[PDB]
Amino acid sequence: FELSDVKSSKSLAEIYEDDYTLSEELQKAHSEISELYANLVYKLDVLSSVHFVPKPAETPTISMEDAPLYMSNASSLAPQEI
Amino acid sequence: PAAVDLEIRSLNSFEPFDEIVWFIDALTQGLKSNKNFELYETFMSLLFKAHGDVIHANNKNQDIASALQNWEDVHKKEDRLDDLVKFCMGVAAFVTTA
Amino acid sequence: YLLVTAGETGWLKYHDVSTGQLVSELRTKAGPTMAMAQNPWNAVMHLGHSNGTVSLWSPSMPEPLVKLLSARGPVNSIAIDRSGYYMATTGADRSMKIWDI
Amino acid sequence: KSDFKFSNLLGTVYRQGNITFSDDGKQLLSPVGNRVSVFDLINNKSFTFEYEHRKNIAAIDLNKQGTLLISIDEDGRAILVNFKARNVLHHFNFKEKCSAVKFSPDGRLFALASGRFLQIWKTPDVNKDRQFAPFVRHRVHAGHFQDITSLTWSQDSRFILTTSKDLSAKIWSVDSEEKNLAATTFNGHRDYVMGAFFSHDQEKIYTVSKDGAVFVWEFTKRKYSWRITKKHFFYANQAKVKCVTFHPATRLLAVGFTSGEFRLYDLPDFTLIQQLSMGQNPVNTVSVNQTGEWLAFGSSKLGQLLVYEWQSESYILKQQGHFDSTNSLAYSPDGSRVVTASEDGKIKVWDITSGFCLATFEEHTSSVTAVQFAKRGQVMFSSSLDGTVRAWDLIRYRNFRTFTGTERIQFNCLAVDPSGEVVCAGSLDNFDIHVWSVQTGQLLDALSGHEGPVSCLSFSQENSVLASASWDKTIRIWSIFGRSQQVEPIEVYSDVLALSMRPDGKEVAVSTLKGQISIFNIEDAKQVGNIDCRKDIISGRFNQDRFTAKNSERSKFFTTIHYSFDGMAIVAGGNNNSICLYDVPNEVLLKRFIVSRNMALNGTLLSTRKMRPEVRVTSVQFSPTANAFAAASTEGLLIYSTNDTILFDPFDLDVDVTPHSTVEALREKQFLNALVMAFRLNEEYLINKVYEAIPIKEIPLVASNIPAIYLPRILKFIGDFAIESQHIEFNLIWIKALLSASGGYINEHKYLFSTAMRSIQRFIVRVAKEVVNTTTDNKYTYRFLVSTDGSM
Amino acid sequence: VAPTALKDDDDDVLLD
Amino acid sequence: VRKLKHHEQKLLKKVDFLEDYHKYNRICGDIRRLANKLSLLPPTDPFRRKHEQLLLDKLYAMGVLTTKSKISDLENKVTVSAICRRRLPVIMHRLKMAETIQDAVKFIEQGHVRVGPNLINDPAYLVTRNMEDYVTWVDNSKIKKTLLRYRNQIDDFDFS
Amino acid sequence: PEGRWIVSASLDSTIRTWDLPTGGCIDGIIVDNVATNVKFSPNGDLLATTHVTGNGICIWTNRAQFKTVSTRTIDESEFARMALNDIDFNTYTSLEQIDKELLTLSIGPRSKMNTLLHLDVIRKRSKPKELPFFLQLSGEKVGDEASVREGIAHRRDQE
Amino acid sequence: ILLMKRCRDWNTNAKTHTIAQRTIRCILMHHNIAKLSEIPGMVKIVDAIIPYTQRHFTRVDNLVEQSYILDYALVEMDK
Amino acid sequence: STRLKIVDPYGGSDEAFAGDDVVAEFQEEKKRVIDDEDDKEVDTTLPGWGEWAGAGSFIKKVKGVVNKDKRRDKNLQNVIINEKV
User: Fold this and answer.
1) Which Cys pairs does UniProt list as disulfide-bonded (chain E)?
2) Are the C-beta atoms of D1 and D645 separated by less than 8 Å?
3) Number of C-alpha atoms within 13 angstroms, CB side, residue D345?
């Protein structure tokens, strides 16, 4: 942990306001880790592929690929697990 | 399927429970026809799912029990299928195996 | 020695050939540019849009010299005479407009 | 000795184009790359049309009568097909890229959006004999100065609304006399106009722009002219309108955006009925049902087709196809389900009857190379280029165990013991076969002996022997089970690429680089057969080849082979444009299939890789039902089946045998003779007719008297007929009589009846057992309530 | 008409 | 334009606007931004360490790295020269399969060279480390006949 | 192509279509000029015939490929002068119920029963994925540790 | 509460589930199930015994299904 | 007009304008440039500096780029000149 040595742009109201309302920036890294490897994975693959390699690719969301819609989660647990 | 589930759930649950009795009688007649059995079996399953508590609380009521009892006399005849299905596994698994 | 490009993106690119650098980048706020033309006298760009307003543009300044609508419909093309006194346009509503710069 | 025909495309639902609801509203037509697929939503079934375009499909439309389906590719070449009979009617070239095609609501005319030109043509009469030049153009219209985005018909077949990139919505009159009525161009929008629609009364015209603005147009006095009375704006932060549709009867507005979300609205009030997000990829296409209760949506990037019931907020259809090519496929032992694997690394479970994705698995990081089932079928296993082998329980759909090597060996092939207790995988980099224990999850041992990469693996179903093949020019037979371990190498002429094991477990065939399918006896380890494949294979010259196809040596071998469950045929596939079905005992080509006919696929006919898609089959297996085989290819899973049975193949037919005579025997009550004579004719309608018309009392008598030769054929008929038939008790009684009377004969000859028995157990396990499960539960749900005391 | 053409209020105030 | 005179040059400069390794330069640069940022992410993180291993294994699995490597080396071992030496025609030459790179390109284009089971007609194809052992001529190459004809080991039965 | 019919040409200037399963002539034609040859297309949608007169090849459109054909035997006497419906159309439809006592399922897909039974969990899984100017803050966060030591220390609002 | 906890433990073992099931049957047959529900701690112990009870139902039924081998034996004699 | 008449084997056997109001849009734009470019009288009264302010109970002129009466586009119809740049 590191202590800021410069003015906090947020005032005491704002500091206490934030208190009322593992890390996103750390996950923002991990998110922006991923694509360039997905980009790096594709480029040397198409260089190294004999065969065709396709390029990898508010409002509530429809989840279209479901990993059964009729199965119940409770039915997926063993008598030992419960 | 969506219409059927709203339909059975909406069925009223106040005494004298006439419509619940009427629905049991309708399915009892349906089983006698020996047609649409898997469908006729499953609406009764939804009936218990949506109104099992309502039926259980008033078992001693004559009207529910009488319509209920007749459905048993019908359903009890359609137990041959369980014995019928049960044989073919015993020989099919054995015949292919030993 | 400057190449100016107008596109449906509406971002007006100013590129100088000799220096090989983009002089300035500007958004019209009038939507896609239907018509593009230059006035030789003052080297001022003329742009056409659906509203019919014609925006006079230069690399130097942030927002256009002049906004004129001559035709009610979109201006398909803009013509400037060699002298630069006269500027002619044809609207998409069959209107033809002769103008003085 | 059966005729296989293309039936449907699995692993794949949508690529691009416009989705169209059937007029009845019970079916959905989706263009699938070079073909078009139809999904029966009510019946939960799907089929893919046999006809194929020269290039990928661009626009389609089905007439309200449901008899004429028109499809146009990106080159403008149109194919007219009879929807009911599924036969092509006419081939026409419009010589232009047609953005949209839409039939008139009356059906006599159909309009084509062609650049900045609108063409209106006359629909041919299907009732008429096949006409040579049936297309006559009614008119051609062009006032736009830029490409037409879309067109809309008036409900009365008299006016057309067309939207273009000129920021204008414009109307025509289909009748020349009525030109003065509708000759207006509507302006005002700031970006491209996406959709122009009529109200139900047609008094109002609604125009939608890409910016997200909806303009309501009404005739009014300022003497009377069209004006924008009301303006609505979609305040999407950056999403742009991608597709729009409108239903006049219910006043529903469905808009698909580039951000991957959609919004439902009730005009003219602009009430947001619902907003859901389809993903991060653009919503390419949208359609509305005839009743207006079902909404079909489509995004091209991930191959997305969804159907939404906004009334009940329920999903009718929700299925994804593989982003990459399918590398392997595996059938369930009964054939009810098939599992597919792709280069992405995702496994998907598909149901043959419905043809829809039951489940998807995302645990494998890299490409899944091989997929296989255990004999029992409850468990599934897969190997991937992430360095792991994973076991899957398909009842609860969980990865109950994962396997991996010490040094993360890359696996390309996988094999599983019939007992489901040993799993063996092979690698291209290690030259060794890793062996594990299913129950414990540890490495039992490493089978060494190959000096080349292990190309394929397989366990004998019965004898449980392992046969391994490698680029080391030899094949090794491992008797791993037992106190002592023996290995029997059989050297081969050239590099072996694929291996197939006999269901008897007595023989093994292997496809080699030379284009030879060599068949070896496992016990004696000597060659018994060999088939040439070099000449039969069809390979097309790629566009960049500087050497001819005939001189080319790129792929005249089969990288995948499998046996027929009867044991007399081999289906073979490779990096080519051909699937060849061979006959093992006598060594010929039974028949050959063309996998694709799209030119965009390379093989159909300095720092940058020139690199484009190629036509190929990765894996091909037979269906255990012995009626179909599936081939994994780039486009998707091609299933070829023998279901139609239009062909006439009598067996032991004589002059006295006739359909009329068979009916006469039934009328005379000679059920046994009628059944035998019907089977001799081999006509399903006659085989069916005799089958029900016998009374239940006479079933045991007839069953006991069936000749042995006809026994396997009647059992097969019952199994396939019973799976979809409604007479569960009637069909079961036959299975009782036949098993009771001829059961001993089945045991003596298990393999002759192996397919017929399996079809029977599928019927009784997958539908009959389920029915009794509900029946007993209701019986027990009955008893508890009555006996138990009611609450106070 | 356009050329393309074909061819009680219940009070919400309630006592409690 | 023509060569500018001395006074012309001094008044106006950089007016000269209006084998390529641009892609490999981008490939090298992209590898740099990973290891630079993978260093930015905290060391104790499990997600960084696995991701570093996948990269090192995979450029190893390529042969851009002749031997197994640490990230610290990866900011200097990777080079455009490393990618080019993996090019099939450059692999073709070191094996002495073709005398000159241009000769190798011609053979690749004409379709006389197979790598494992698959034929390559693209010269820009680069070979991986598990795969170079199996680069060779197609079985029916006319080149493969002259091979065995001189050595008098041309076996017709293999059709080569 | 399906092996179900023969079409034969004869010097009597007639073309006859014969149905093998019943072994009878089902259709008859009279051609002005004798047809020397008759060949079915590989698909069967076309039939090609050549004749004694004419340098071209006559092509015939197989209507059977578009709709069913009755297999009733042609009338011989009528043809000379010119010169059970399910069986007739080679089809059959399964009975609604073979016998009243025999059990029969519904005429529809078998996945319907599975959908009705579990329809409740269908809806749950198909559901789409999801300040004041005087705050009221006290305790340790505000530094009032004394109140905490002395013992002095929203679902309904959501509800 | 004490009795069913024993039945839960007995139910887990396939060699002692038979004793547990009959005891639970008598509870349901000789008590007001409404009172059984309201007692605290019932439900959680109650939750554990379906998955084992259902497992015993998948078994036994297979034991039941196989028994028609005898019905195959007798019909073979009748021939 | 507005329909091509093409004579070839397959055929050849045998306008109004509507839009929004642009003038008002531009005629709206003309004030906004005028108002922004005109001089502004900002009220610099500090409420309560010397009087009670609450529930119970000075103008500075800012120079613009051009006065509204000195604009070149004035008297030019359909013309807007932005004197500010």
Assistant:
1) none
2) no
3) 15
Min distance A21 CA to chain D CA atoms (Å): 25
Query: Which is nearest to D621 in space by CA: D346, D384, D326?
Result: D326
Kindly state the DSSP code that residue G73 receives in the 8-state scheme.
P
The 3-state DSSP class for residue D361 equals strand
Residues of E engaging D, defined by a Cβ cutoff of 8 Å? 1-6
Secondary structure of residue A45 in the 3-state scheme: helix
φ, ψ at D589 (rounded to 5°): -90, 115
Q: Cα C31 to chain center, whole Å? A: 12
The answer to whether D723 and D717 are in contact (CB under 8 A) is: no
Question: What is d(CA D760, CA D728) in angstroms, rounded to the nearest whole number?
Answer: 12
Give the C-alpha separation, C61 to D636, whole Å.
57
Q: State the DSSP string of chain C.
A: -EEEE--TT-EEEEEETTTTEEEEEEE-SS-S--EEEEETTTTEEEEE-TT-EEEEE-SSSSS-SEEEE-SSS-EEEEEE-SSSSEEEEEETTS-EEEEE-
Q: Is D29 left (phi over 0), alpha (psi -120 to 50) or beta?
A: beta
D185 CA to chain C: closest CA distance, Å? 9
Please tell me the distance from the alpha carbon of residue H72 to that of residue D434, in angstroms, as a whole number. 44
Displacement of CA D567 from its chain's centroid (Å): 26
CA–CA–CA angle D86, D91, D96 (5° rounding):
125
Between CA H28 and CA D590 the distance in angstroms is 67
- How far CA D316 is from CA of D275, D378, F19, H62, I67, in Å, comes to 18, 28, 57, 36, 66
Q: How far apart are CA G83 and CA F126, in angstroms?
A: 78
- Please tell me which of the candidates D171, D180, D201 has its beta carbon nearest to residue E5: D201
Long-range (24+ apart) CB contacts under 8 A made by H47-52 are H47/A82, H48/A82, H48/H8, H49/H4, H49/H7, H49/H8, H49/H11, H49/H20, H49/H24, H51/A77, H51/A78, H51/A79, H51/A82, H52/A79, H52/H11, H52/H12, H52/H17
User: Which resolution, in Å, applies to this structure?
Assistant: 5.9
What is the C-alpha R_g of chain H?
Answer: 18
**How far does the CA of residue F160 sit from the closest CA of chain A (Å)?**
24
What is d(CA C43, CA C48) in angstroms, rounded to the nearest whole number? Answer: 16
Nearest to F119 among D428, D429, D554 (CB): D554
| In the block, residue with structure tokens 């939804």 | B46
What SS3 class is residue F32? helix
